[PDB]
Design a protein around this nucleic acid. Structure first.
Ligand SMILES: [Ca+2]
Ligand SMILES: [Ca+2]
Ligand SMILES: [Ca+2]
Ligand SMILES: [Ca+2]
Ligand SMILES: [Ca+2]
Lengths: 286, 286, 286, 286
DNA sequence: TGCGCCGGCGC
DNA sequence: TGCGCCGGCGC
DNA sequence: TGCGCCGGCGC
DNA sequence: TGCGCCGGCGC
């Protein structure tokens, strides 16, 4: 049959189709297009043909398509990542946090101290104002790793006891919390202004961490390379951007002769800023 | 037996005593102390006593203790990290880079674009000037990961063929290099001004990466908490600092009844900015 | 009569009213409210009463209200700033750039080199991909300062000739461009996601500058302190946020007893992150 | 007469020759040279010759040349900047801070919150640890601006009463302190590692400011371009570097026929990363 | 070579 | 309540 | 006091 | 064409 990552990739698409997240309205507008832009329209039509989309229905409201894209991205990650246990073992959990959560990063080892700052600020309003703060990281999807018992550390050799390596992050106990492995931002579609919150979130993770920075990634179904470029280009905040259908996007850009769009596409891909959704699970194993 | 990490820790200490790196001169000054300062003198002597330091010899040139401390840290990480294959598998290398070689990080995937950038500056002086920046990132010790065969991704299951997950960093071939896993900076002793180059370096890794940030840590044998804090305190550049002899420092701070410095020790240690050398191998397995 | 800044402040409001930028629809929704949020509705109603708004008309499309708010903010700045010539002299120009421009910062001394990087990237696609780039700063409104002749430098004393101070930024000649004094972002209303492009723009200005960083400021008519807070709180990117009607906002928060909103309001104002529109001209003279 | 800035420049040089800061020891080593290196030896001797350095004495202790170079830079800036009141008016102070005093920038408006932050850490150790960071920003030389009376804002026109522009930074009273205009770091000579503390400091000013960023510059007497470049190259932390004797350096680089170093000089100078001491007073008037 | 190592100690 | 989701489209 | 200055020179 | 504007509102 298919290789399993290939099957999960199609499962991923099938859920977008089945849910009418991806569909075409009766004016021929594919639902991830900017219907008032010809290039967006054409690129999204082609991807949707390549994905064998057939349903005709009205575009879903954006809150609905945004939410569903996250859940569906979340299910793909969890399912594929859990097959990489021999390359990246651990007690992994993949969670869609939500578009309504907050303070959630403080749940995790590298950012726990942010609980203490918040509580300090609410108690002392002078401290609140004097503070820079910035404890507002609300990821769409997290991947976390729970902590390991000595039994696991000492699986094959007597490596540790209670008198050595007493601060190691992976060691369960002393009120240690789970590690944040990845923050995954989802963008069903992009406009260059609303795309920038992924950068500020990446930036917040970078500047406030105690310990190893998580993976910071963005997944998008945006059809146009230019809008993808407002989040993908540049370094420092975002590790890499992953497209819901890269291969399909490549094909359509080639057959349409949007030559600047194709050039921008290769700049990002060859520039290590844009990958396929199927590359994400393995990139989470590095 | 002792746990193996406790044995490794004692081997790291005995390399510093045996190699005359950590020793006491004819005036009673321990060789990581700042002899002009009573507290640094007393804290360092206290650490040497708890390490059972016995040798009398004159302080080595700075350049020699610097290099030697670095080799011995490098050997500790390599021997101890190799025990952790079941929690962080792979084909790992640990290397002690040096000022001799140039453009070292650019041999690794997340920073390879820096070669192209330098070649571009080199041929066009107008471009060299426009970009401004030249010199590039040179950590003391790096840990790198070699890439993985398809047979090993597919060890258990038919996960990938050559038509899926084709940009994934860990996958061998496709114009791929090894991955930088960790940048480890060493400071045998510290002065607050010359500590800061570990921060500019950390920042360079951060801002320039394509892919997940490496581990960015500092290992130091500095005796006084105030000097350690010049590098330890704060977040954003350094993941964590590792003391060469944390338990002994804590113990001497208590015995010398230096409460202000004991406070600062705990600010750092309780604040997750400072740990023992022995936490580092497990911290690199996150 | 009124002090002149007070008159410009009312002129500013009158243009928002006259243009129906600020008005109330026939359901009682004030046009800067989020009509589906009760607190937004109530706060905007009160400000609009305090500004003596009377017109009833349908909300303008967002592209129209956004554009007009910029022009109107632009006219206020220019007009008031030009009265500060004795505190901040110079050949000043205030320009609404537009929501369609690009590369415009490269027009200015501190960012000119960005022209060279763009031209280098389009010529060499390998260089394009290898590049980090990030020359995408599109301010809404700029303030610039043209360069000064020796006659002005030497107005009262013979300070300079052609053999001293030959690189001074303010000196006209040798193909020197005008200085960027300020970038002013306008946000008629806010949602926390679309607010973050002001941060990335501020960040781009910070990281790419050669010479003194411009003022980086945000002007907003957003009624709710919480949405204002998604751009105002935190430091490093934005110098300060200026509200189109702060005094009115203070009054209404007090009379409504939204006590957490009032607390957040004082956190920002007392925390030097939020000011009135009338404070901007003087803050541009520092 | 010479132009006044040319006279000031010669007075700055003669303070270094007369004060024995810049001199040649009995071995022919000029006192800002690294005697072990032929190029630094030759470039420094060449600069001393063009400055008409005549004194023979032994090199002063590092601590003394460091401090003395700093006082003399400070005096140059103060005397020359005072001539620029017609292009940058105000009530300016120039001061040479020192390691003796602590929490110096916090006396200025944009960084006053740092006092509150430190007081908060000091009373609550859990908070001190949560925040992590303690120590704070200590530039070598600062230029500050005192605040302005209402009579002077209203000198020409009735601009403001007490009901408008009530949070404006420049306006005296209302719980206002002076403004930090410039942070000036000095490095009599450089080594690449100890250069980097001017970068961490620059970054601290950047990231922590409430209001416009101060001028952030470095003045250095370092002879070799490679060492100057360790601080000069790049953007984001330092606005610009200023050489103590740029014309003389350029001239010696040409006469010594050191083409590689001449290149690097131009990369820096043409790239707007390096200028002469004499450009600094006008650069602070931007 | 020259970069970046650490040390001594003045302010 | 409220935060952040995407969509329509003018300038 | 102790922080942050610069210097010598090994690798 | 295309970039960035704001608005409606679900989850
Ligand atoms: Ca999202
Ligand atoms: Ca080092
Ligand atoms: Ca805007
Ligand atoms: Ca200095
Ligand atoms: Ca010495």
């Amino acid at each position: 049959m298919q290789p399993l990552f290939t099957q999960e990739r199609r499962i991923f698409h099938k859920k977008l189709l089945d849910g009418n997240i991806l569909a075409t309205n009766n004016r021929g507008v594919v639902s991830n297009a900017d219907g008032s832009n010809t290039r967006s329209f054409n690129i999204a039509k082609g991807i949707a043909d390549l994905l064998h989309s057939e349903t005709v229905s009205e575009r879903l409201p954006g809150q609905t398509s945004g939410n569903a894209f996250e859940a569906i991205c979340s299910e793909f990650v969890q399912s594929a990542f859990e097959k990489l246990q021999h390359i990246r073992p651990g007690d992994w959990n993949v969670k869609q946090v939500g578009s309504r959560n907050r303070l959630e990063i403080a749940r995790y080892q590298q950012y726990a101290h942010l609980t203490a700052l918040a509580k300090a600020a609410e108690e002392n309003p002078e401290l609140a104002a004097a503070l820079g703060s910035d404890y507002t990281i609300t990821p769409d999807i997290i991947v976390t790793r729970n902590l390991i018992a000595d039994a696991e550390i000492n699986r094959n050799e007597f490596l540790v006891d209670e008198n050595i390596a007493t601060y190691a992050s992976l060691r369960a106990g002393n009120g240690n919390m789970p590690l944040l492995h990845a923050s995954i931002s989802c963008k069903w579609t992009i406009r260059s202004d609303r795309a920038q919150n992924a950068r500020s979130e990446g930036l917040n993770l970078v500047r406030n961490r105690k310990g190893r920075l998580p993976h910071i990634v963005v997944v998008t179904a945006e059809p146009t390379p230019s809008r993808i470029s407002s989040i993908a280009l540049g370094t420092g905040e975002i590790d890499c951007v992953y497209h819901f259908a890269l291969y399909e996007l490549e094909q359509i850009l080639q057959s349409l002769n949007y030559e600047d769009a194709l050039d921008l596409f290769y700049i990002m891909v060859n520039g290590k800023r844009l990958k396929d959704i199927s590359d994400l699970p393995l990139d989470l194993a590095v």
